[PDB]
Amino acid sequence: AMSLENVAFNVVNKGHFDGQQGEVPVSIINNTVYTKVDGVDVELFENKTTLPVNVAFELWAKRNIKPVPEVKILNNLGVDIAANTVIWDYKRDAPAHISTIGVCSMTDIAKKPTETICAPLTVFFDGRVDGQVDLFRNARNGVLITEGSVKGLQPSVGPKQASLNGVTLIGEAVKTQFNYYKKVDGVVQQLPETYFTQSRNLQEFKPRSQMEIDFLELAMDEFIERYKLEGYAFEHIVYGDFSHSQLGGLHLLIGLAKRFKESPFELEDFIPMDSTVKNYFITDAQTGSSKCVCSVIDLLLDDFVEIIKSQDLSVVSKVVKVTIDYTEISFMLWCKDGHVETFYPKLQ
Amino acid sequence: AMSLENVAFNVVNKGHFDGQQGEVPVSIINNTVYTKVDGVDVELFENKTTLPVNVAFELWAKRNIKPVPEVKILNNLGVDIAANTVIWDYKRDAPAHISTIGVCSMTDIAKKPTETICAPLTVFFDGRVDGQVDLFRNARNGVLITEGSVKGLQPSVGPKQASLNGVTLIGEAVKTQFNYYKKVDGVVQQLPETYFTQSRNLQEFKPRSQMEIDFLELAMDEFIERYKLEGYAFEHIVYGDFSHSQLGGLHLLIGLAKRFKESPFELEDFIPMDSTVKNYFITDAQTGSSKCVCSVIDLLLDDFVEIIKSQDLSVVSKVVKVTIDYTEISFMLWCKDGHVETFYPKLQ
Amino acid sequence: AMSLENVAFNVVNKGHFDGQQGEVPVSIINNTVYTKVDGVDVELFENKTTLPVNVAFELWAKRNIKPVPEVKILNNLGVDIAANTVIWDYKRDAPAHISTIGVCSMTDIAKKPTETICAPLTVFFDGRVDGQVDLFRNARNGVLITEGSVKGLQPSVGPKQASLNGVTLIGEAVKTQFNYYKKVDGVVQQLPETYFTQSRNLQEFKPRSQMEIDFLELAMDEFIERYKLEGYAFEHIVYGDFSHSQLGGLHLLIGLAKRFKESPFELEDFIPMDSTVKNYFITDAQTGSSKCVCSVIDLLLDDFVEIIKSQDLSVVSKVVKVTIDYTEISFMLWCKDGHVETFYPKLQ
Amino acid sequence: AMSLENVAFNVVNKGHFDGQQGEVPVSIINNTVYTKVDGVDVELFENKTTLPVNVAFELWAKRNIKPVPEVKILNNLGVDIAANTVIWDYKRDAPAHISTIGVCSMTDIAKKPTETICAPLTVFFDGRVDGQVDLFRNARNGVLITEGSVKGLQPSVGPKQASLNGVTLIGEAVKTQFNYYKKVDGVVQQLPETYFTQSRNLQEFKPRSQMEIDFLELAMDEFIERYKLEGYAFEHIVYGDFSHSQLGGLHLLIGLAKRFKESPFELEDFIPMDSTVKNYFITDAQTGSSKCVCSVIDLLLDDFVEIIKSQDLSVVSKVVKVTIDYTEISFMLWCKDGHVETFYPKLQ
Amino acid sequence: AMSLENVAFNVVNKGHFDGQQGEVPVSIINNTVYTKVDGVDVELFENKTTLPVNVAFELWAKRNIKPVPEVKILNNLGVDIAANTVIWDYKRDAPAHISTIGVCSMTDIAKKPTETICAPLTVFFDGRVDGQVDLFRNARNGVLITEGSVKGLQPSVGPKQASLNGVTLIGEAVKTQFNYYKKVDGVVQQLPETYFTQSRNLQEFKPRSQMEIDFLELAMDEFIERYKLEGYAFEHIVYGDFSHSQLGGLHLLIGLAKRFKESPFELEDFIPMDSTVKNYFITDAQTGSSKCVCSVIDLLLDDFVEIIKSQDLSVVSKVVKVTIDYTEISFMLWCKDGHVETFYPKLQ
Numbered sequence A, B, C, D, E: 001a002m003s004l005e006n007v008a009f010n011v012v013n014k015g016h017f018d019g020q021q022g023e024v025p026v027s028i029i030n031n032t033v034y035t036k037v038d039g040v041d042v043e044l045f046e047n048k049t050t051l052p053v054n055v056a057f058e059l060w061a062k063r064n065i066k067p068v069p070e071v072k073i074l075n076n077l078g079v080d081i082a083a084n085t086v087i088w089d090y091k092r093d094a095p096a097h098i099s100t101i102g103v104c105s106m107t108d109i110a111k112k113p114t115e116t117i118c119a120p121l122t123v124f125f126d127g128r129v130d131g132q133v134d135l136f137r138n139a140r141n142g143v144l145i146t147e148g149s150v151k152g153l154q155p156s157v158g159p160k161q162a163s164l165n166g167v168t169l170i171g172e173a174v175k176t177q178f179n180y181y182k183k184v185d186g187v188v189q190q191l192p193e194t195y196f197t198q199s200r201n202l203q204e205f206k207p208r209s210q211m212e213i214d215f216l217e218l219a220m221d222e223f224i225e226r227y228k229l230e231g232y233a234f235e236h237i238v239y240g241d242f243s244h245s246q247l248g249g250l251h252l253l254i255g256l257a258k259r260f261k262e263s264p265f266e267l268e269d270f271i272p273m274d275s276t277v278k279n280y281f282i283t284d285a286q287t288g289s290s291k292c293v294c295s296v297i298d299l300l301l302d303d304f305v306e307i308i309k310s311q312d313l314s315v316v317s318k319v320v321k322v323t324i325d326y327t328e329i330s331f332m333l334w335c336k337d338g339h340v341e342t343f344y345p346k347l348q
């Protein structure tokens, strides 16, 4: 017996939808849901989605509160919809998927993922929920996550990190590293060998290797000397060049984090969403050096060093394809006289 | 001669409604009030209330700009309406009360609190305003604050802190500690003996006793040893247990402040309002330990230690009622073999 | 061939309007522009202006992304409209000017500033764009900026700082110091000798002279002694008096920055816009000292010291006019027995 | 090259989307699309749909302007989507279908109905458009309309009337009677024998048989005598009983039309949509007789007489199923002593 | 002392703005203005304009309530703004002009039309208001209306009809026929010889000549015989051809009125505004004959006959220009063998 007043009762009393019985008085005005608390209206939810306010409130209340794959991973794996859960996209303040299965009467296309409407969609399945591994085996299209082995299914080890209530973390009290599986047209697909992005923030960036500790602590020329990166244009690509009106390089998150400690800068996130490669309109506050489209990726410095050192440096320009977060990321590699000039995630 | 243009003139020229004559051009679009300044529209107010935009703008302009009791105190005392002022609720960005008395023609139920419509309502009176002590004596229901003694009225010493323009502070240049008085059905009511919450923030938490300085500086086991808290489950209740998927304890603000210095965490304020006990959906970023409903109270550590040490520890589970901010707060006390297992502000 | 879908394509692919061909799917709901990215809506723009959402989105996409004069300078110079560009006002999240010339079909009053509709308006011209110096020579009213000399035109050296994508900075990789020129009724006007405001923030305030370094580092009495400021009421005007309910003085940004390091305080920006003098409703969190209208100016301490020391101190009260950012700023100077009592930017 | 400005140009110049090149200035405010005409804003469209305003404007501009099947017929035949057109639902002021095929980038699930996403959907095909009879030949699910014979397919003669720009009419200058074909999972279905509703209005009702002319002209008792309708409760079912507080019968549109000529009444259309049976909250203005749910069907009186005269009248109450507009309509038949008491389209 | 509350007081008590003192409580919600009447909100105004709700409410309250020229006339004469009045455009539910002079602080560009901002605008002047004939004497650009003679100026006799509170009428108790004067750049213009549109409605159409009485009463062939109209294609142009899918001719309002008496039809007013020629998407309900863009003009039948009989009929196709309502209306004239095939107001 689903209702707006029951969803609101669950939010007020349980912090989210918890299947509890009860009703609280609710008022909807414009895009906000309020509840009366001791004579006055208290805001429960502000709709930032393109769905109706009461519908978005219900999907947000029904969000998955266990560590789940980051939306960029689900997107890279072609996930269209989730089986009997809502993956909330905290970067967009919206449901990661348009439709639902067995969640909300307004957005449901089916009650169970076995319904024929779900067959052409890549349904996300969670092995931590009873019966979901079986539903994946029976699904025409799907993505499955598990905490352990599934008999006969060849796994793909996913990233160490997962999103728990919008906080990306490597779990200590909970498991965040999942086995990943995918099916296309009834056939289990071999997930490719891949690097993973580290999902760090600029302001609270922490190094995850001795090379990253050395990058943040050492001066530019001694880090390049220590790690034998001469001729690999780290001065441009990673450290960034702030000497001309157009900001040069600065494509690795660690390089932005290093710069941020010394001088602040504005990063305009003009397409705010979770993605393997992010595009920012950057303006350096100290110099005035800027770039409309600065592609930034958060790779572990060792992984980036491994990618660039593996490259043939004998051609002027070429596309270098690298699997990152299960997706093919195109990089533009520019060389001259056997040395790198630039290497960046190619702006489509 | 009240008007939208006159209220806006006062905001622009006086920083708030100050009874000054004058008009400025105003435009209202959706929920925002703008004023024309040198040919362009400048935002004066964004309506976050459930009242009409022009009405909410007037109540906000007419807000009390002197140190006033925090909304949680007024609510705990049963205050329905204020006499000839607006107590602005900065936690909700809205008037603390639905109706007004002698403030705004759209929200007024009366011009004076002596009107019979006010008799069944608990009217808030401010002894710092001429004639308000007399109006309280004549009111059927009411709450009065004063800076000094009222002849024959037995006072209740309120908290040291008050809210001045949304800033909770213990006044040095202004008085923030008031005497409190209450009347129910024409009869002056004895306010109970009470503890007070400290109204501190997580990010700018400052200790207000030697015990609080010792809690923040000493390690867990030496603080428990120094203050003889063995068998009182401070490891769980105050420090917090981040070892399991469900976050254990963590019900005192000081414990959250200590944790915040070392590791960050998300506190989802799912019912955003001022209250003695706050409920948060907490997610620890370091471990992934989380709790949908984590009740948090900001008591002075000495007061919490005094409350828990006063308890009989011979029963498995019982409700412990403690007067805090004039309200009865129920705590759930769980014991085993004469020692505390947990003690928390009981989730209703 | 201008279109909503083409503007959105440019934002998504180029970080702003860049004259590129292409279209992306767009949805408009209420005041927000979204684009479909892999099946889900992603927010591109939230309209905070009084213009229609699609119109404001286009003007924001078409904003000038080169270092431009800060809006306070343009306003002080009487600028009504810009020639073939949009000066985006980042303090208001809106176009600095109501109308456009050769920018957007909904806001354009003309395609070229030579059209007779532009003659009575003070058009902003940018010498860095080909043909704009010539358009200024032919304009009846206008303001021109250049990076160098214009034959026969007597220049005015503007501030060192300019706004680049909303970041106020003194350019190192780009030029931010412009020559300024103005015409009124076909006649080139002599711009007056002026001081410039420093455009600093409270939280990231940096001293720009040895006197400012000494103000932030030295104690009040030794700074006043070192710079011979006895009898100039710096204790009141610059340092601020937090001993009474009404906050005394505190009119220089550097004094607020010094106070902010020790004790936090709330600054209510009740008219949020760029201006030479700013008015704040200030509440000191430590003491509870407050002021509804506290005028604050960010002058270099040396310039303020030079202004106040140049004053005749023999009259009780008088208006002192000082040219700052090309505008006449009135200050109220109060003296007693040949010493300053107060000196503040006069509240109109 | 689809765009908001181009759609608006087509509406302004061609009365609808006509594939013409050009752009007009547009402004979007709340749910309304305006265009500038000689300096002032002129309303082009008001969004009454649940889609974004600019998306709904485009679908409405791209509506089919030829006589098309009434939405109730398409719904009764299970139509999910239309092939390369928009069937505009004038009763709801909205698109008849959620998604489109080759119409609008925001709503399109495919560009051609041959795409595999369309195979499980019942696609509407219009034989008047080149290649659509052939697209229905290879479609898995679909409904086809034609003006003539299709080789190899036996036709189902549809209603005489069609909707042309929201006007339901029997065409004289255009053909409105179509042949209907339907296929489910690649198999051409045998459409059932069906009656059709007449789709008339209460205020402009015209009789379409000699029996209907006699019903409107003759008195109740002489019409029942002429057509030998004694014992079939036409006094209750068709004429209506306005003698008690609850309005009795009145389930045939012709009976409402007859009553409307003499006395006015209110019909509250509480579910405003096109449907074979309509439900109204009726209040008779003359008597005050009313009914919350009065089911009304517009059958040709001869067809209703044939249905009621082809029923067994020996049971107290039973469900009578009748194919009307290709759907199964349940009627509740109530009898006593071999005579009808009531017969109405069953409220379920 | 202008105010929202004072404007509302005038609307409630005087039916419009009447300069009366007083205030009523007002609430603004979305685009609607309400007033409290005995405890409940009563709607005063719904904003259908692109201006802010409170601004549009004031301009509507301040509308001219005397018979004024129809907006189509003012537009055709190039009127930009009115002197100290608001011409309310009832066809658009909006002010006829963007800006005002001495009316509303939000829309005013000047207080008096003698201000230099008004010199390049064609200001509307009303000789019925004291001093306006004299203000037109010294205005650079303007249109003047008078009820009588102006010394030194030759008049242009305007239409018999004017708009009084949105009702177009030929005044009997008030004068609606004005003398028109116009000046461009200080020079009094010679207004051209012009026909006038009759501004009639389809449903309440009344003939204004013996020819119009004969058109409405006689059959098609005897009217054409009586007025010797053989070969002028009145059967197509005026009567309309409803025999093919595309509706033929039907460009004179009188022909639509004649058709409307016999058979109803839908006229979709896709550009709702006052104009000399109107464009409708017409659907004939009886036949299904339709036309996306059917240009309709309401000329007196005698005037249309004079125009068509004063043309050379020897060319296949040509543009015929006719001054109607002071503007040049282009007609497309199509001939064959010395006879008219069609003649219609040119869709451009």
Ligand SMILES: [NH3+]Cc1cc(-c2ccccc2)no1
Pocket (backbone or CB within 6 Å): D133, D136, D137, D138, D150, D151, D152, D153, D183, D186, D187, D188
């Ligand atoms: N072979 C199954 C089938 C045949 C058709 C079909 C459709 C149109 C004409 C003739 C045949 N549609 O499905």
Ligand SMILES: [NH3+]Cc1cc(-c2ccccc2)no1
Pocket (backbone or CB within 6 Å): E133, E136, E137, E138, E150, E151, E152, E153, E183, E186, E187, E188
């Ligand atoms: N001298 C040029 C001129 C004359 C007028 C004018 C206007 C009204 C009456 C008589 C003259 N308007 O412009």
